[PDB]
Amino acid sequence: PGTQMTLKTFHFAGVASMNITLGVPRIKEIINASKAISTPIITAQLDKDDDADYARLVKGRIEKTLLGEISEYIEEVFLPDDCFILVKLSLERIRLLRLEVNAETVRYSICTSKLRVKPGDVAVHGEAVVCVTPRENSKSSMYYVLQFLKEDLPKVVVQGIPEVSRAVIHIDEQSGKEKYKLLVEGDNLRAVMATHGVKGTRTTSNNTYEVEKTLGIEAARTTIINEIQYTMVNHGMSIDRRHVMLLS
Amino acid sequence: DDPVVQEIDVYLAKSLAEKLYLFQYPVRPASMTYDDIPHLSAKIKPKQQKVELEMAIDTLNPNYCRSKGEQIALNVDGACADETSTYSSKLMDKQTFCSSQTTSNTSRYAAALYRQGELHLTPLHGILQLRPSFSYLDKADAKHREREAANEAGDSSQDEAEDDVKQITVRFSRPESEQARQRRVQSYEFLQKKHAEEPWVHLHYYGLRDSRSEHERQYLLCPGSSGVENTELVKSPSEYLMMLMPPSQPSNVLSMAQLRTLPLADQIKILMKNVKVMPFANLMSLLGPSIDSVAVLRGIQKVAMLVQGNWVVKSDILYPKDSSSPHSGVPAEVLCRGRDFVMWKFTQSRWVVRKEVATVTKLCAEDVKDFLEHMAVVRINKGWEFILPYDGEFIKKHPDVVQRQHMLWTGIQAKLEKVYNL
Amino acid sequence: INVEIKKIMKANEKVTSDADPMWYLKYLNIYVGLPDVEESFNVTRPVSPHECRLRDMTYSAPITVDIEYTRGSQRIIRNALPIGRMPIMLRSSNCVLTGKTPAEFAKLNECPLDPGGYFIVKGVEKVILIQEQLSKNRIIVEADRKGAVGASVTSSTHEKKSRTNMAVKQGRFYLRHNTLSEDIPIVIIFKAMGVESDQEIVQMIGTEEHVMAAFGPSLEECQKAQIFTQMQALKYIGNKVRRQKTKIEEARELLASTILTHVPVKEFNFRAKCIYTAVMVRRVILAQGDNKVDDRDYYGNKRLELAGQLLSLLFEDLFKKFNSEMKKIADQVIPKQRAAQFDVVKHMRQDQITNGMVNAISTGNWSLKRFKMDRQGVTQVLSRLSYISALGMMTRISSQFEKTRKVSGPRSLQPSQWGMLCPSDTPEGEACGLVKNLALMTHITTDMEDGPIVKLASNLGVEDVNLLCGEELSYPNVFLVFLNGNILGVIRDHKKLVNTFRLMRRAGYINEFVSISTNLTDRCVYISSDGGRLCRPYIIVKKQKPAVTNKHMEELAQGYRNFEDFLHESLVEYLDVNEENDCNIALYEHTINKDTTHLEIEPFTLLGVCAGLIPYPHHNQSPRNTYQCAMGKQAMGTIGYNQRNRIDTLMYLLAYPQKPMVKTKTIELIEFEKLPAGQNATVAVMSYSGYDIEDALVLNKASLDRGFGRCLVYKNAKCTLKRYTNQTFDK
Amino acid sequence: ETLEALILKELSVIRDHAGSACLRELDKSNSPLTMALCGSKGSFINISQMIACVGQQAISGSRVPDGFENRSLPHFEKHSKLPAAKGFVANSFYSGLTPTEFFFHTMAGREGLVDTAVKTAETGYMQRRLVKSLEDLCSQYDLTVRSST
Amino acid sequence: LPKDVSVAELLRELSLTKEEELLFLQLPDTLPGQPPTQDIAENACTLADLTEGQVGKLLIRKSGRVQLLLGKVTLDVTMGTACSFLQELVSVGLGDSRTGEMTVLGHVKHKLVCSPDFESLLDHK
Amino acid sequence: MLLFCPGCGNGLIVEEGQRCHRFACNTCPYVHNITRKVTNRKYPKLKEVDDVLG
Amino acid sequence: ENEQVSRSQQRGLRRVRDLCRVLQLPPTFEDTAVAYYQQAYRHSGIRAARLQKKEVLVGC
Amino acid sequence: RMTVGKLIELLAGKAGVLDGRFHYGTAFGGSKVKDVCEDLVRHGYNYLGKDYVTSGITGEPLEAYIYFGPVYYQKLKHMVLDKMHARARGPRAVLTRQP
Amino acid sequence: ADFDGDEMNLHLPQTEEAKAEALVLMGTKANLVTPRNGEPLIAAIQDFLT
Ligand SMILES: Nc1nc2c(ncn2[C@@H]2O[C@H](COP(=O)(O)OP(=O)(O)OP(=O)(O)O)[C@@H](O)[C@H]2O)c(=O)[nH]1
Ligand SMILES: Nc1ncnc2c1ncn2[C@@H]1O[C@H](COP(=O)(O)OP(=O)(O)OP(=O)(O)O)C[C@H]1O
Ligand SMILES: [Zn+2]
Known part of the structure; x- marks a missing residue:
């Protein structure tokens, strides 16, 4: 089948996006069982698959949302009394994306693996205003660290799993009913299954290492078998399941 | 688009031709100028122009830090030495702007002063870029080095008399190879020393x-x-073009320009050797109307013959004495005889038979084919016809030439009848 | 053999030794002479290529030179001294085949239709394929293994070649060079190259908000350290320099000569180099956003090195080696030999250059130590399977990759190959995509002086880059102008500049091979004048009407004008890849619209020699044409009119060859109809007896008996009877 | 990408309609049609390409990329996303292909060649590894697959 | 700040206002003249060889064309690189071999470039 | 933003003096006290609402 | 061999080869010349001879 | 394989050998199909190349017309006589005793 | 194969046991189907289906 396959393209599996490696490279990665694979996929089912609001809610919950992607402007203001960075959160975009993120959650996210900023440095004045006032650490650093702050602050995670990089809402339009599911391009199945609103009993992943580490060796075997069968069927050629079972 | 208005005049001034410099500050915007900054002096050199300005900056202004000024002063200079100090007081008062040379020759640049109805142009003797130089930092580094040396020397309370008599370490002025000497000459230190040798x-x-x-x-x-008519600046566009762009220093290798650049005789010879069929009017049009018709006639009569009003290149011109047939290898004389016989047959009758020509000349097929293609075309049910029509205009215009060509063709016919026994 | 050899001889005209001064050896003029053979006893005799092939010898000419030296302080001159033997290419200027008629070719036992252009050494026919490489002295922005979009530049001058890169691995620009211990920030190099003002550095990098935001980290990293002066920057650089203030001097020397060799400095004036690195950083910043990454497969940045450049480099290297050997022999002989004055004529080894050339042409492996160039497969045996095979192998092009990785990028057919290389002609196998053939109509440019080009550029108002700061480089209307990778300067309204340059080139004051291209995304006008660039002729179109007319075509047919006259009359002009990238071309007259500058001469010329044999190729598939070319490269047929006297290790001829009935204009041009490689048979498309199931065919017994398909295989059996050291011989 | 997908869909619809028209107008007893019906060799796709119209030349599952600056070939205007300027082949093999169409087909041809031909090394290495790894198992008599150990 | 043109610049400098302005123009390398009695050769003829007085005229045609008639030929004047940094024009006269005088004549704001009309030079002959 | 000293042109850093915060250089005594509010907005691109795929 | 050879014999052989190559003589002639030179050097009278003697030996 | 070029070449060659001419197969041009069809119908042969043919084995006419015409076939150097190989015990290699 | 010049190999066993094993296990009549999915590979081809 490796020679029979021509390594075609445009096979987005019906989403017209999320280019996934399929064919001989995918079979190679599977037989190698590398800990980190290219373009990993995670398919998760929803408890409320008919409502799009809950789907977008769980999407925002699982997907990583940086501070710069939700704040409308971050300005380093140097008032004659003190210098500090003021972040203005766009509550409009927050409520549009249905993210349960507020000034308190932003403050809690701050001070986590960021040059050890103490809780007293960050403060809240308004409803969507965040004031960060750093201090000299004496470790070859002075008050002129607001530049490093402006650089590394917009990329701070305020909500979502750090491992998850992108998540989309896939829709199946079966005549019986139109259902929704989550397609995550991440490498963390445990977090997706632990997040609220995700039917962890019907969550599948493409990374054999993660499947083994999370659901066990039998789950890893089943996932390998299913992935090989799907990758082989995508090319129109069929193989007896006994071969893939023996391989797994 | 005509000059309706704004007919401004341009004048030239040579008063400040050798005393005009253009100093530009790449780091100072045009908004803020140095008109209010009191200057102190400017060091310069006549040759290898490199000007260094020495100014003075205020201290009582709120935009100056006195503590940092004292710090930098104590770092660049000593405590109370004051024999060679970059600053008079204990604060940074003087600033150093060093000049960088943009180009060696600045003759193409000129300053234009605009007045009401006239524009005066003055050449520039030099253009320099002034930038804030950092030499007090190097002096402070040297000061710190000598201070560290003094500390290492006085590490002990009382330093005994050191018997460090300088032995005679006179190194050899070894003969430096050519490569090493060129490297030393091109080294930055040598150029810096050469520039410094010149006094300020x-x-x-x-x-x-x-x-x-x-x-x-x-x-x-x-x-x-x-209004004054300038004696100079009266060269033509062609002369100006030649000035601003001076020169660097098959048989159709020569182009049209390379052909025209040759004498009329060689021009006609090459044209005939290339074409082998062309009317006199076409030859005149190609050579140009400025050349005399009698000259063109005298040139073509020596390297061509008249055939039905048209001109055909002679056979020897195409086949030199040292040449041979490229297909059969026969000598050039036989090829010339065959071509002359073909031309005679064409002059006697417009229709020539390839089989008859071959049977007469006793030549192969390819040579006859080439001879016929050089001056005729194939016509079905008629044989070979001359490529050009009968040109009677030239025959009527030049009757003497017609008689000369007729007697020449009669002589050629006699020779052919004697040779081939027609 | 006419100009480059003389230039090399002039460059290496004088050679002397350190010991015993006042001694030297000055060459005055080098000659190549006509092809001769050293068979006779110290006598020269003209030898033909066919005789060389028969006797298994080399077809070379004796290299002679005139010299002058000082034996005992008395100047002694020699007007003619042999020093080597240069294999002469067939149909060259000094070859015996040039300027000969078919009768003389028959007398010399050579085919007139033979393409020639190949060397004959030891009887075997070797051809120097055209090597393809990337253009030198050019910034290339590309992504790293980790995805970092960095820049690289391989500055290659006549002496050294150095590739320096710049990465943004940690948000700041680190410059990497092979002579540095660790990559250092770019701001330190800026401060070391004279420009110490951070304001000036920022103005040179760019004045855009995003540019400043992206460059901030570099300024911060520089301010973190105590590097603020040129002296401190040079000290840091020297400390970071590897082993080969002394450190400061070495750092300055590496910054002036080693790094960016193509950027010249008048006298330790790094203004041009600073502007160059600033433009490079600006391009890197602009690429760090929109993914406008340059591709390597774009042939507009490729350079083809013909056999001339390779032979020139080899001759220069061999001459340098010979000079070094002579200097060593002198240093060893003159000081302690005897009172008898020593001269070079007694050690002027004449076989060194001959053996070097013979080996470089036969083995094909070229190892130039002075340039650190180790190439293989340069020369290949000329395939005499057929005239078409030889004519197609003569016009092949080898790639620089040489099957180092299955990249699939360069192996693919790029749109840049329009009119230059044959799209369909490509060997089928592992070398698919790396071995290509030239188109039917194309040309390779040579090197010019560039003097008048620079003069016209300076007279057209190009402002000096040293007169203004780098802030002007950030304006939208100020376009940079580059000359062979070197920043020629800045300009405004590049349309007028390009129009005037093209008009002057068409007039003829500038060489027609100088290409001019403009890229608006970067605002850069490149003026290319180096050799090896691919060009194609095109008819000039002005105001929806081509310049060439029926009258001009009739004059050409009658012989009043030629292609050179067309070129001179601003009717047809050569266009490069980079020039056609900006110019508009039309395929036919009906396709000409208002926005058109040139017209295609002929469409079929897109195909190559091997592809021209395909009758009606546009009605078939591409793999079909590829296999057809691959099989024509091995087809059976007559080689030439001297195939009977020719003796090769393996030859295939046909009994009754016939010319095709459906012949192409390419066939008529290459004169393949005179030497066909097949026969026309009355084929009937049908199934018969089931013996033609999968691509097989059924032949007729009577047809085969009547002589159809009869072939002749000619093999050569060679035996040598040589004399050994002892006075004995094989009998 | 939306415009790209719309243009590709329109070209595919045109190709399908042309193929249907050719199949409906072609009369029985035709050799290509009979061979495509019986499945011996060829298909309706090839029949329509060689009779009605050639399909969109897709390189790596997309239109012809812009080799030159903002355009595939100099013969088309800059920033021009027309079908004939991006890879569409309006003429058929019977009527003859234009220069640009033939060049795109050769480009697609080159793509095919390289892919199949040098990919095979990939499958050769994969098969070598798989066999060297799985050459130890065998079916025993007790209906249990066991390794060599 | 929109990009100005030479015609509008001269118009607003002459009509809208009357105050003088210092301009800096870049002339070609070789001028269309001969060094008057300068001991030669077809060498470069710069302003250092020409004398004082009227040497040329500045014409402004319709459509914004700005030409310079410096004899039989006519160059074209265009707006050079718009410099925004400080440019101070000064004359450093060394009246004595020991002491001189630096006189700031004015400030330079605009830059012009004069180029030969190669199109005209070619279509003339 | 990125400010430079008019004297030398080096980068200016924000520090705290004896009266009020000020921009100062690391190579000259030049300083500049802050009188009114100074801001430098960037307007980072917000995350658009990813619609359903299918 | 080539190890029990002195610098004088090595210089003689190198001079023989250099002259054979300057005269553009074939490698067969070069081999015969070096062989005859070794055969002559085998003797002691020529082994311990003059510099001009060994030069003329190369020549002969 | 969509080799309509072969059919076009065959038709052009038939027309050429019938009318005593040499048709041109130039890329992106050449002689069209209409000209060769006109030549065939003028010389009396079918305008599509197919001609009435009779089976030589059974002697009866075929139900479908055969496509006859001149095609330029070229023989390759690949010969079965040279590619035929049969190895007996034969010699072996010194290092490893194998063929 | 496609009969386009492909060169195939032919081997002759030198043992009766090897001959029997080749005829039984590697028999063409016994290997008419592939072990991948059981589809028959030895069947009709072009010029036979039509
Ligand atoms: N039929 C055949 N063709 C070959 C073979 N080797 C090379 N060729 C052809 O000629 C080329 C390469 O020859 P090389 O591999 O370079 O010869 P070489 O390897 O350099 O010889 P070495 O320097 O000893 O390695 C390819 O382009 C092939 O088309 C071969 O073994 N058989
Ligand atoms: N490198 C190779 N490795 C293995 N087999 C090869 C190789 N090269 C050629 N072959 C043999 O040749 C065959 C390839 O033919 P295939 O690619 O299917 O047709 P093709 O060459 O595309 O012909 P068309 O162009 O379709 O007419 C299959 C394989 O057994
Ligand atoms: Zn400062």
């Missing part, structure tokens, strides 16, 4: 607000009438 000249500064500025600003003008 100190000049005073006169701001734009001084009366001397307006007093000397008038030298950019020149006394002259409004």
Whole structure:
């Protein structure tokens, strides 16, 4: 089948996006069982698959949302009394994306693996205003660290799993009913299954290492078998399941 | 698009041709100027222009840090040495702007002073870029080095008399190879020493607000009438083009220009050797109307023959004496005889039979084919016809030439009847 | 053999030794002479290529030179001294085949239709394929293994070649060079190259908000350290320099000569180099956003090195080696030999250059130590399977990759190959995509002086880059102008500049091979004048009407004008890849619209020699044409009119060859109809007896008996009877 | 990408309609049609390409990329996303292909060649590894697959 | 700040206002003239060889064309690189070998470039 | 933003003096006290609402 | 061999080869010349001879 | 394989050998199909190349017309006589005793 | 194969046991189907289906 396959393209599996490696490279990665694979996929089912609001809610919950992607402007203001960075959160975009993120959650996210900023440095004045006032650490650093702050602050995670990089809402339009599911391009199945609103009993992943580490060796075997069968069927050629079972 | 208005005149001034410099500050915007900054002096050199300005900056202003000034002063200079100090007081008072040379020759650049109805141009003797130099830092580094040396020497309370007599370490002035000598000459240290060998000249500064500025600003003008015809600047466009772009220093290898650049005789010879069929009118049109018709006739009569009003190149011109047939290898004389016989047959009758020509000349097929294609075309049910029609205009215009060509063809016919026994 | 050899001889005209001064050896003029053979006893005799092939010898000419030296302080001159033997290419200027008629070719036992252009050494026919490489002295922005979009530049001058890169691995620009211990920030190099003002550095990098935001980290990293002066920067650089203030001097020397060799400095004036690195950083910043990454497969940045450049480099290297050997022999002989004055003529080894050339042409492996160039497969045996095979192998092009990785990028057919290389002609196998053939109509440019080009550029108002700061480089209307990778300067309204340059080139004051291209995304006008660039002729179109007319075509047919006259009359002009990238071309007259500058001469010329044999190729598939070319490269047929006297290790001829009935204009041009490689048979498309199931065919017994398909295989059996050291011989 | 997908869909619809028209107008007893019906060799796709119209030349599952600056070939205007300027082949093999169409087909041809031909090394290495790894198992008599150990 | 043109610049400098202005123009390398009695050769003829007086005229045609008639030929004047940094024009006269005088004549704001009309030079002959 | 000293042109850093915060250089005594509010907005691109795929 | 050879014999052989190559003589002639030179050097009278003697030996 | 070029070449060659001419197969041009069809119908042969043919084995006419015409076939150097190989015990290699 | 010049190999066993094993296990009549999915590979081809 490796020679029979021509390594075609445009096979987005019906989403017209999320280019996934399929064919001989995918079979190679599977037989190698590398800990980190290219373009990993995670398919998760929803408890409320008919409502799009809950789907977008769980999407925002699982997907990583940086501070710069939700704040409308971050300005380093140097008032004659003190210098500090003021972040203005766009509550409009927050409520549009249905993210349960507020000034308190932003403050809690701050001070986590960021040059050890103490809780007293960050403060809240308004409803969507965040004031960060750093201090000299004496470790070859002075008050002129607001530049490093402006650089590394917009990329701070305020909500979502750090491992998850992108998540989309896939829709199946079966005549019986139109259902929704989550397609995550991440490498963390445990977090997706632990997040609220995700039917962890019907969550599948493409990374054999993660499947083994999370659901066990039998789950890893089943996932390998299913992935090989799907990758082989995508090319129109069929193989007896006994071969893939023996391989797994 | 005509010059309806704005017919401004241009004048030239040579008063400040060798005394005009263009100093530009790449780091100072045009908004803020140095008119209010009191200057102190300017070091310069006549050759290898590199000017260094020495100014003074205020201290009582709120934009100056006195503590850091004292710090930098104590770092660049000693405590109370004051024999060679970059600053008079214990604060940073003087600033150093060093000049960088943009180009060696600045003759193509000129300053244009615009007035009401005239524009005066003055050449520039030099253009320099002034930038804030950092030499007090190097002096502070040297100061710190000597201080560290003094500390290492006085590490002990009382330093006994050191018997460090300088032995005679006179190194050899070894003969430096050519490569090493060129490397030393091209080294940055050698060029720096050569530049430093030239003595400096100190000049005073006169701001734009001084009366001397307006007093000397008038030298950019020149006394002259409004309308004066310049003796020079009267070269033609062709001459200007030749000045601004001076020169660097098959048989159709020569182009049309390379052909025209040759004498008329060689031009006609090459044209005939290339085409082998062309009317006199076409030859005149190709050579040009400025050449004389009698000259063109005399040139073509020596390397061509008249055939039915048209001109055909002679056979020897195409086949030199040292050449041979490229297909059969027969000598050039036989090819010339065959071509002459073909031309005679064409002159006697417009229709020539390839089989008859071959049977007569006793030549192969390819040679006859080439001879016929050189001056005729194939016609079905008629044989070979001359490529050009009968040109009677030239025959009627030049009757003497017609008689000369007729007698020449009669002689050629006699020779052919004697050779081939027709 | 006419100009480059003389230039090399002039460059290496004088050679002397350190010991015993006042001694030297000055060459005055080098000659190549006509092809001769050293068979006779110290006598020269003209030898033909066919005789060389028969006797298994080399077809070379004796290299002679005139010299002058000082034996005992008395100047002694020699007007003619042999020093080597240069294999002469067939149909060259000095070859015996040039300027000969078919009768003389028959007398010399050579085919007139033979393409020639190949060397004959030891009887075997070797051809120097055209090597393809990337253009030198050019900034290339590309992504790293980790995805970092960095820049690289391989500055290659006549002496050294150095590739320096710049990465943004940690948000700041680190410059990497092979002579540095660790990559250092770019701001330190800026401060070391004279420009110490951070304001000036920022103005040179760019004045855009995003540019400043992206460059901030570099300024911060620089301010973190105590590097603020040129002296401190040079000290840091020297400390970071590897082993080969002394450190400061070495750092300055590496910054002036080693790094960016193509950027010249008048006298330790790094203004041009600073502007160059600033433009490079600006391009890197602009690429760090929109993914406008340059591709390597774009042939507009490729350079083809013909056999001339390779032979020139080899001759220069061999001459340098010979000079070094002579200097060593002198240093060893003159000081302690005897009172008898020593001269070079007694050690002027004449076989060194001959053996070097013979080996470089036969083995094909070229190892130039002075340039650190180790190439293989340069020369290949000329395939004499057929005239078409030889004519197609003569016009092949080898790639620089040489099957180092299955990249699939360069192996693919790029749109840049329009009119230059044959799209369909490509060997089928592992070398698919790396071995290509030239188109039917194309040309390779040579090197010019560039003097008048620079003069016209300076006279057209190009402002000096040293007169203004780098802030002007950030304006939208100020376009940079580059000359062979070197920043020629800045300009405004590049349309006028390009129009005037093209008009002057068409007039003829500038060489027609100088290419001019403009890229608006970067605002850069490149003026290319180096050799090896691919060009194609095109008819000039002005105001919806081509310049060439029926009258001009009739004059050409009658012989009044030629292609050179067309070129001179601003009717047809050569266009490069980079020039056609900006110019508009039309395929036919009906396709000409208002926005058109050139017209295609002929469409079929897109195909190559091997592809021209395909009758009606546009009605078939591409793999079909590829296999057809691959099989024509091995087809059976007559080689030439001297195939009977020719003796090769393996030859295939046909009994009754016939010319095709459906012949192409390419066939008529290459004169393949005179030497066909097949026969026309009355084929009937049908199934018969089931013996033609999968691509097989059924032949007729009577047809085969009557002589159809009869072939002749000619093999050569060679035996040598040589004399050994002892006075004995094989009998 | 939306415009790209719309243009590709329109070209595919045109191709399908042309193929249907050719199949409906072609009369029985035709050799290509009979062979495509019986499945011996060829298909309706090839029949329509060689009779009605050639399909969109897709390189790596997309239109012809812009080799030159903002355009595939100099013969088309800059920033021009027309079908004939991006890879569409309006003429058929019977009527003859234009220069640009033939060049795109050769480009697609080159793509095919390289892919199949040098990919095979990939499958050769994969098969070598798989066999060297799985050459130890065998079916025993007790209906249990066991390794060599 | 929109990009100005030479015609509008001269118009607003002459009509809208009357105050003088210092301009900096870049002339070609070789001028269309001969060094008057300068001991030669077809060498470069710069302003250092020409004398004082009227040497040329500045014409402004319709459509914004700005030409310079410097004899039989006519160059074209265009707006050079718009410099925004400080440019102070000064004359450093070394009246004495020991002491001189630096006089700031004015400030330079605009830059012009004069180029030969190669199109005209070619279509003339 | 990125400010430079008019004297030398080096980068200016924000520090705290004896009266009020000020921009100062590391190579000259030049300083500049802050009188009114100074801001430098960037307007980072917000995350658009990813619609359903299918 | 080539190890029990002195610098004088090595210089003689190198001079023989250099002259054979300057005269553009074939490698067969070069081999015969070096062989005859070794055969002559085998003797002691020529082994311990003059510099001009060994030069003329190369020549002969 | 969509080799309509072969059919076009065959038709052009038939027309050429019938009318005593040499048709051109130039890329992106050449002689069209209409000209060769006109030549065939003028010389009396079918305008599509197919001609009435009779089976030589059974002697009866075929139900479908055969496509006859001249095609330029070229023989390759690949010969079965040279590619035929049969190895007996034969010699072996010194290092490893194998063929 | 496609009969386009492909060169195939032919081997002759030198043992009766090897001969029997080749005829039984590697028999063409016994290997008419592939072990991948059981589809028959030895069947009709072009010029036979039509
Ligand atoms: N039929 C055949 N063709 C070959 C073979 N080797 C090379 N060729 C052809 O000629 C080329 C390469 O020959 P090389 O591999 O370079 O010869 P070489 O390897 O350099 O010889 P070495 O320097 O000893 O390695 C390819 O382009 C092939 O088309 C071969 O073994 N058989
Ligand atoms: N490198 C190779 N490795 C293995 N087999 C090869 C190789 N090269 C050729 N072959 C043999 O040749 C065959 C390839 O033919 P295939 O690619 O299917 O047709 P093709 O060459 O595309 O012909 P068309 O162009 O379709 O007419 C299959 C394989 O057994
Ligand atoms: Zn400062």
